[PDB]
Amino acid sequence: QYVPYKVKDISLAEWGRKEIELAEAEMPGLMAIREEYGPQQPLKGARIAGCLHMTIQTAVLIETLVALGADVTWSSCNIFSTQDHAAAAIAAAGIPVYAWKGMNEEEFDWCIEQTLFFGEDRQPLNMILDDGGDLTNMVFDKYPELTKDIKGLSEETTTGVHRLYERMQNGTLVMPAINVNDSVTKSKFDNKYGCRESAVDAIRRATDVMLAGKRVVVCGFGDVGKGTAASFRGAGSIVTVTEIDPICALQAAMEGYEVKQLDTVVDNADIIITTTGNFGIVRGEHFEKMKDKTIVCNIGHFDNEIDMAWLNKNHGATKVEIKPQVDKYNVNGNDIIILAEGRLVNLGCATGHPSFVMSNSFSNQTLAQIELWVHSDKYENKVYTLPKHLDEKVAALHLKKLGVELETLSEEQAKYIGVTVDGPFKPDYYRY
Amino acid sequence: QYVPYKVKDISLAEWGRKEIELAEAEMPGLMAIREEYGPQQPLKGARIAGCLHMTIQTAVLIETLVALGADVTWSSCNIFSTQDHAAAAIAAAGIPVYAWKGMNEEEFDWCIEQTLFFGEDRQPLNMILDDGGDLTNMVFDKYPELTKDIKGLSEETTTGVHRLYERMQNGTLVMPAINVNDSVTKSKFDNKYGCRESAVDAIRRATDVMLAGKRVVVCGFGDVGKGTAASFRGAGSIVTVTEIDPICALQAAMEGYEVKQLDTVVDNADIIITTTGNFGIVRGEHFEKMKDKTIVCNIGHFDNEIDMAWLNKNHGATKVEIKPQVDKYNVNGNDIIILAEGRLVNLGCATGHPSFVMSNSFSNQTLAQIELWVHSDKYENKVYTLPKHLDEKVAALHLKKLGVELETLSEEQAKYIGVTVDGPFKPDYYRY
Amino acid sequence: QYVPYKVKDISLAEWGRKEIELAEAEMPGLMAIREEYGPQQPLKGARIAGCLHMTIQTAVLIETLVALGADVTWSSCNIFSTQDHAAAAIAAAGIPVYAWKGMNEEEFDWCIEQTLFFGEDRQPLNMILDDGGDLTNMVFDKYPELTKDIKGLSEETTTGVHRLYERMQNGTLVMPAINVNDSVTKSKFDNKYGCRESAVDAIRRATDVMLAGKRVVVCGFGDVGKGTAASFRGAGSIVTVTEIDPICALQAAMEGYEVKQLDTVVDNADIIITTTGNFGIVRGEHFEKMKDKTIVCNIGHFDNEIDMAWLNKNHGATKVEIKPQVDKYNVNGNDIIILAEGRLVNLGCATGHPSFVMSNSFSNQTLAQIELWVHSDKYENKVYTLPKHLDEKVAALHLKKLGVELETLSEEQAKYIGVTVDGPFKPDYYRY
Amino acid sequence: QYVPYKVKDISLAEWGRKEIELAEAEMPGLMAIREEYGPQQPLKGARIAGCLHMTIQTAVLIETLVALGADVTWSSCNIFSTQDHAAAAIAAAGIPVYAWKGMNEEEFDWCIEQTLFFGEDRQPLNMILDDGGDLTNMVFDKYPELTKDIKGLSEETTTGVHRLYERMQNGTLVMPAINVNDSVTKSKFDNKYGCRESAVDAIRRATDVMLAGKRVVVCGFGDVGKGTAASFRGAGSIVTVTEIDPICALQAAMEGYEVKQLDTVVDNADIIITTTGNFGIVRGEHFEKMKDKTIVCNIGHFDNEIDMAWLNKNHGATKVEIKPQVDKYNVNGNDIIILAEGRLVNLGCATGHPSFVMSNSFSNQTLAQIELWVHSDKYENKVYTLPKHLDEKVAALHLKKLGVELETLSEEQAKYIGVTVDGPFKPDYYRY
Ligand SMILES: NC(=O)c1ccc[n+]([C@@H]2O[C@H](COP(=O)([O-])OP(=O)(O)OC[C@H]3O[C@@H](n4cnc5c(N)ncnc54)[C@H](O)[C@@H]3O)[C@@H](O)[C@H]2O)c1
Ligand SMILES: NC(=O)c1ccc[n+]([C@@H]2O[C@H](COP(=O)([O-])OP(=O)(O)OC[C@H]3O[C@@H](n4cnc5c(N)ncnc54)[C@H](O)[C@@H]3O)[C@@H](O)[C@H]2O)c1
Ligand SMILES: NC(=O)c1ccc[n+]([C@@H]2O[C@H](COP(=O)([O-])OP(=O)(O)OC[C@H]3O[C@@H](n4cnc5c(N)ncnc54)[C@H](O)[C@@H]3O)[C@@H](O)[C@H]2O)c1
Ligand SMILES: NC(=O)c1ccc[n+]([C@@H]2O[C@H](COP(=O)([O-])OP(=O)(O)OC[C@H]3O[C@@H](n4cnc5c(N)ncnc54)[C@H](O)[C@@H]3O)[C@@H](O)[C@H]2O)c1
Ligand SMILES: Nc1ncnc2c1ncn2[C@@H]1O[C@H](CO)[C@@H](O)[C@H]1O
Ligand SMILES: Nc1ncnc2c1ncn2[C@@H]1O[C@H](CO)[C@@H](O)[C@H]1O
Ligand SMILES: Nc1ncnc2c1ncn2[C@@H]1O[C@H](CO)[C@@H](O)[C@H]1O
Ligand SMILES: Nc1ncnc2c1ncn2[C@@H]1O[C@H](CO)[C@@H](O)[C@H]1O
Numbered sequence A, B, C, D: 001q002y003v004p005y006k007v008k009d010i011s012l013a014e015w016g017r018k019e020i021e022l023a024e025a026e027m028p029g030l031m032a033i034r035e036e037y038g039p040q041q042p043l044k045g046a047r048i049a050g051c052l053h054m055t056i057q058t059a060v061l062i063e064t065l066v067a068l069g070a071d072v073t074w075s076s077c078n079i080f081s082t083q084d085h086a087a088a089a090i091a092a093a094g095i096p097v098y099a100w101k102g103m104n105e106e107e108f109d110w111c112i113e114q115t116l117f118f119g120e121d122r123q124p125l126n127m128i129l130d131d132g133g134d135l136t137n138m139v140f141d142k143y144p145e146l147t148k149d150i151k152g153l154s155e156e157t158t159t160g161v162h163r164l165y166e167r168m169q170n171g172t173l174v175m176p177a178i179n180v181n182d183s184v185t186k187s188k189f190d191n192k193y194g195c196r197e198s199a200v201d202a203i204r205r206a207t208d209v210m211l212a213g214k215r216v217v218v219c220g221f222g223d224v225g226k227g228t229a230a231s232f233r234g235a236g237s238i239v240t241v242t243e244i245d246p247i248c249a250l251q252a253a254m255e256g257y258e259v260k261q262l263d264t265v266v267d268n269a270d271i272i273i274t275t276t277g278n279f280g281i282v283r284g285e286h287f288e289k290m291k292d293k294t295i296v297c298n299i300g301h302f303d304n305e306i307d308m309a310w311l312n313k314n315h316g317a318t319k320v321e322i323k324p325q326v327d328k329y330n331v332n333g334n335d336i337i338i339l340a341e342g343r344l345v346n347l348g349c350a351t352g353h354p355s356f357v358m359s360n361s362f363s364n365q366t367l368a369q370i371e372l373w374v375h376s377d378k379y380e381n382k383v384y385t386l387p388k389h390l391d392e393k394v395a396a397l398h399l400k401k402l403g404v405e406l407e408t409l410s411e412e413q414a415k416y417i418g419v420t421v422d423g424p425f426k427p428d429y430y431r432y
Helices: A010-025 A028-040 A056-067 A084-092 A105-115 A134-142 A144-149 A158-170 A184-207 A223-233 A246-254 A262-268 A308-318 A345-349 A355-378 A388-397 A411-417 B010-025 B028-040 B056-067 B084-092 B105-115 B134-142 B144-149 B158-170 B184-207 B223-233 B246-254 B262-268 B308-318 B345-349 B355-378 B388-397 B411-417 C010-025 C028-040 C056-067 C084-092 C105-115 C134-142 C144-149 C158-170 C184-207 C223-233 C246-254 C262-268 C308-318 C345-349 C355-378 C388-397 C411-417 D010-025 D028-040 D056-067 D084-092 D105-115 D134-142 D144-149 D158-170 D184-207 D223-233 D246-254 D262-268 D308-318 D345-349 D355-378 D388-397 D411-417
Strands: A047-051 A071-075 A127-130 A153-155 A177-179 A215-219 A238-242 A271-274 A294-298 A320-323 A326-331 A334-339 B047-051 B071-075 B127-130 B153-155 B177-179 B215-219 B238-242 B271-274 B294-298 B320-323 B326-331 B334-339 C047-051 C071-075 C127-130 C153-155 C177-179 C215-219 C238-242 C271-274 C294-298 C320-323 C326-331 C334-339 D047-051 D071-075 D127-130 D153-155 D177-179 D215-219 D238-242 D271-274 D294-298 D320-323 D326-331 D334-339
Touching (some): A010 A028, A010 A056, A028 A056, A028 A355, A047 A134, A056 A071, A071 A105, A127 A134, A134 A144, A153 A355, A184 A294, A184 A334, A184 A355, A215 A262, A223 A238, A238 A262, A246 C184, A246 C388, A355 A388, A388 C246, B010 B028, B028 B355, B028 B388, B047 B134, B056 B084, B105 B134, B134 B144, B134 B158, B153 B355, B158 B177, B177 B355, B184 B271, B184 B294, B184 B345, B184 D246, B223 B238, B223 B246, B238 B262, B294 B345, B308 B326, B308 B334, C010 C028, C010 C056, C010 C084, C028 C355, C047 C105, C047 C134, C056 C071, C056 C084, C056 C355, C127 C134, C153 C355, C158 C177, C184 C223, C184 C271, C184 C294, C184 C334, C215 C223, C215 C262, C238 C262, C308 C334, C334 C345, D010 D056, D010 D084, D028 D056, D028 D355, D047 D056, D056 D355, D105 D134, D127 D134, D127 D355, D158 D177, D177 D355, D184 D223, D184 D334, D184 D345, D215 D223, D215 D262, D223 D246, D238 D262, D294 D345, D308 D326, D334 D345, D355 D388
Parallel strands (some): A047 A071, A047 A127, A153 A177, A215 A238, A294 A334, B271 B294, B294 B334, C127 C153, C215 C271, C294 C334, D047 D127, D153 D177, D215 D271, D294 D334
Antiparallel strands (some): A320 A326, A326 A334, B320 B326, C320 C326, C326 C334
């Protein structure tokens, strides 16, 4: 039977609403887009299923989509990332949301599947909004009959984008897709500066440990690794980076970090955090070398960066929960502290990124949903990014809140550098 | 009638004990002092009343004093700083503790008064361990008859030390006192690096706001102000400092901060945090100038740095609690967000300093209690500090945990610079 | 008549050679390329005219090209950037170099023109190696008859690349061109980290001023602006950034800088430095507002970022040379200090970037010259970049010198993220 | 016969004067003291011999003393620290100065001895102004007959202060002495922030090496070590600190540096710089372990921190001068680069600290000379410091130049914290 929503505790809605109102003031881009596109109702007729961490920030995105005319259903893309008071507030607003903090895997799948059908009539979704690819996979692999009537999808994160390029190479991408991750105002702000805000936050809330003087190994120096390393360095930690990519490794050395193999530094590390989007970064052989009370955690999208299966099989019998999402294992006499069972730690042990940086990602997300819903016929079954002018517009919408003033080119200065006075200001290859 | 303890929820003890065990590993100085002085039972016969934030870290101090032979009673020195699971664990260990998070002022006084008498026999305390001076004032002002049999007191923080110098000038200091605040390993580590760890932590847990690009006004640039400014700068904030002292102001300018009057910067500040130990820093006239959703908080010892009386009198009728210790007031159309009702915010909205830095303060605290209990007859009714050799010993006890190696002077190098090979290494005027 | 070289003082060669030998040890990429391609003589038959700051670093590039088989002639692309002992050493090695520090504009052109013809026979060049486009313009505009026998050109810097895209749009690019600037290992290392090394260096050598606590306005926050801002911030300055581009402006705010219009901050600035590659950044109206003894300088390619014509016309009569390339003007009673007559200040008042970062740029430059000389027939009269594998190779060649260790993907980890174990590791759109 | 001055080249005076005028604008404290005390001629009758690095900054000090009524003679306290154009300008002003860059030791002593007698009449000095103790030792040890008529001495640096405490313990301090080093506005600004400005400066001018990613070993973490470590960290270097003092070592770990024995890190260091004021820090056994082209230098007062005797005895025969004060030795196949022959490197290879920070030290120096000349009868043959009010006054005189605004206490706020509204604001034990 139809289930209108499912949340941990609907009585948390009042608290969630108070925090949503504060978040709105910190998300000027989303609120400006609400205001500019509200009158036009661009998303009228859309039935968007979203699969994205059910946080206070996501609530503002959800209510922006509704404000633009859409019908929306929602689930979280991680079992530990929902903020229960945010979910309760969205449920109390009449929006079908299926999400709570601490789901098991069967519940996680069940929540996604509820979002595919709208109302008692079970009307199918016609738009996909994804973070990591699990909703995309659910529809494409388990409900392929529905794709004929879905106009397109947007994908929010690096890991889900890679899965979309797997599908292109495999001939299994059956609709247009906009890669929101690689808007400049997403990748270079959310992935990097968002993790700078929220990585140390999660370690502090989980463990309360002193960070100054601790040796922190950051595995990876992509956008998440850059921000995560900066997070700990700004708290006084001594950060060593690992990398496979010689360009990213040289960047870390130029920023004043040592860059070593994990095997070189594992036996003296105080904290190890993975940022790679790969698998098998922290293995049984590494756990066997760690010193007592080493904290191990992951801020990449999936928990398989850390071999939790090995740890639970070999040392799970004497696992002790310190408190929820802070587990202590004993490996041959040395305690190992695992945060959020190896799941993305900033959302699992804290609240993820702050509202202001998520306003950039979610402004891109909203513009992508508009573009697909209105203009999907103009696109092939390939992966696209938003045009640079829209990327620039998203950034510009956040400047007044910060007291940032921009210069204005004269027409002659603009011609001198080969641009127009209203932009775009950079060639499409520019890397910022 | 005698009350053996009073805590919020004794069933939190198991969780508290798990966190105490983790804290012990992060407090090598305290555990080393336990180990060195345990066999000697130096505190046998002592009945120490302590008045100090009832945190996990304080639990390790309490159990160190007991391990050294003392009987101990305890209360918190702030109405919001107790960690209820730490209090429960100490209560379950059989130690008289009277403390919970969120006391009112009548309860705060009642808790202190219970600590003055030991057991059903109501045996009076004979040692004072204080943080801020309220326990000292309670005994000296309200129970003066008890001071004849108290061997001495130690005082942990800058504000309580100043009160002790008031008493010296006033002829009302009636026992020897050791100033633990001004051990180098306390003032220059706890006050500064501890606030670097815990100031931003509290703002994040309370508000989840983005700190990068925010204008943060840090009022004061003493040890707490230096650490607090560093806290926000390391998170990407744009910090402006205020000061009355031209030397401290010049330090802030040399560290790359603007230094302005609060009146110059109040109307564009995103966060204002007071660190002065003074009163009347943030006044009604300042609230009237703040922009919408400015966060105002205090990390000095007492809440009177912010004129909360003015704010509650003039705008309390429409106060909204966002969540506990996060209050929203509307001042002439602009929201003002107050953290922890103006009480010390790192303990009120987070967990205070981390264990490792508190091990330095509490190692000094333990050595001071030993020195007074054993050698109080060798002291006048004046304020003293521990000798530099003990200060150096405290620092040395924390080096191995961090992987710090020290050089050893040859006898000839030691003579060259005028020291002995075992220290002390600096003249008593050295400022570090 | 043929002139074999022209330098300030050939007796500086011994000193130049000693510094070249030290630079070789700091340029592992260039020396590795020498070693790998030396036996193959890939540049046999090439007659490369180079127009690029005649520094110690450029000497190692010149001798690498010769080591690979090329005949080379050389001039500097700026009137103040030659290091006379580097020029003398190259002249003493028998290489035709025409360059000294402090040329006038007629001499600058004369030096370029000598490089176009090789030996007493006046054999024409057949390869162009340019930095800024002035050599390209000299050949294309003044000696167009020579382009038929030139196989291609490489261009090293952002400003010259823009000129190449002007030529493409104008139908005046008559040979293949490789954009070396936008190798990742050039733009994201030289432009950014190189200016971090050398911007403050130049201000210190020129003026010896205290940088801590000074208000520095960095105009622009592209790669040069990012590095320049970091240069001054790391010295304790209080940096404000200006920008036209909302994405770059938001980056600066997220990095903890205020971002304002120059007009907002000009009257209180202590140092103003331009990084834009535009013109007309610092105008007469700005000079009229500056406070006494403000230092004004430019680190973009051309001096027209600052309106030096206005300053010399209106206030040149009382100009005082403090020392060479440090000039003091009096504007309505306030002194203005101009560095290097507004020409790129890191090369004009110091020695430009250090050897290690120039090894990255010049490794790319060498590989580009090889690719064009060997494979120019495979290219159209368009602008190209080197493939990502070569970019990665350049970075990898510099890791051992720094003690950087790289992880190696398993074949299964490589397939998981969609790469091969030997790279390239990132999609072509990746921005680092 | 009497010699009126001795400098390298008097024709450098015009250049020196231009730079002195710029320095005056950067030394508001000295110029304010000139202005306040000029009318009173407090130093009338004084004959001050100064022995202090003959830099542009020292020229402003010299001319301030003359402006206050004193007769002055001067020499430099280091063989490499004189700025010849500063010396020429002072000589051209009619002031007896005996100093040039690159003296030998016999010349160094000869210069000091000329300063002891004034004019053709050979009138003896009656005031000593010293930096390091060599002038003090010259008078006390070689001209003891003169001390009866010298009213007192001031001493500027940590090393000379220690020598004064040696003399107190030895009963050989025969006049009052003011320790200028340990004014707060000297030790905590000059020693620390001055070296932050000038340590990296010297390495860049001498070697032009890339600092990002280099491993720099800073020996010592006193005030000079703190500033020197910050210098290199702000340039992107990876700094490891060495220490004998557990408090200073813990400070470095809390600031995010590794802290190791030199023996642990010597074989992989790129730069080693000594800051201890001790001897025998870098020994033959260390040189034998260094890798090729390691840069070794010293920023403590005396060159014996590095065993230059060992290096010259064992490897001097193949020493190569790269350029003046940059020497290359070959130790068993590895090149070692020595800066300034091991003498204080910021003055030997660059220009020492900038004017603004020296204005703080030299404002203290001027007030100390006034206090001794006027009030020496009120002092014993002991070491004294200036009162805190004068320390605060010195800092306050530099605030307007930086745009620093100070708050003003109300009388009630002042009483609350136990001070007066005009200061002093801190107890005498305060460490800042
Ligand atoms: N938790 C968050 O809030 C958050 C935010 C954004 C993205 N993400 C996720 O974080 C992950 C990383 O994202 P990104 O944008 O930084 O990707 P990225 O491609 O920019 O960076 C990943 C880096 O990992 C490196 N790497 C790969 N395998 C490695 C190995 N074996 N050892 C060391 N380094 C290795 C790569 O060379 C690359 O530089 C993805 O899973 C992404 O979805 C999480
Ligand atoms: N929350 C914590 O964990 C924590 C830690 C240590 C100390 N403390 C408390 O914090 C406070 C500050 O301690 P501290 O050690 O930094 O003291 P401090 O004396 O070193 O610094 C206080 C600073 O405030 C400045 N100041 C005074 N009045 C001012 C005003 N009107 N405007 C601007 N600046 C002003 C003073 O000049 C001084 O530099 C005290 O109340 C102390 O007990 C709290
Ligand atoms: N001196 C050096 O060693 C060195 C090194 C590399 C490049 N360069 C030169 O430096 C210049 C900048 O190079 P880049 O790679 O940073 O280019 P870029 O395109 O990455 O950055 C230039 C920035 O200037 C900004 N800008 C343009 N007009 C502006 C204005 N009126 N006000 C404020 N900002 C404005 C643009 O938005 C852009 O972000 C070029 O001339 C380049 O050739 C010099
Ligand atoms: N070059 C400059 O401009 C400049 C400026 C100020 C002072 N100085 C000189 O620099 C030196 C240091 O001055 P300071 O004020 O920092 O003194 P300081 O006493 O504050 O610091 C010296 C530090 O060296 C440490 N140390 C001693 N022997 C050591 C060893 N064997 N290994 C490691 N660490 C060791 C000590 O523990 C101490 O912390 C003195 O010679 C002083 O005169 C130079
Ligand atoms: N507070 C948050 N709310 C929603 N999504 C978030 C939050 N913090 C991080 N994320 C997102 O989580 C993704 C990782 O799956 C990142 O792409 C990032 O955009
Ligand atoms: N976690 C903590 N436990 C106990 N005391 C703390 C903690 N964090 C800060 N403090 C103390 O609170 C005092 C302020 O009253 C400071 O002197 C500091 O030592
Ligand atoms: N030391 C140096 N030698 C040669 N070129 C340099 C040096 N420092 C900077 N440059 C170059 O100058 C160019 C600006 O015209 C930049 O692209 C950069 O590569
Ligand atoms: N530019 C300078 N002029 C004069 N003295 C200086 C300069 N830079 C550093 N010093 C001084 O050199 C001393 C070391 O002998 C330090 O105490 C410091 O005050």
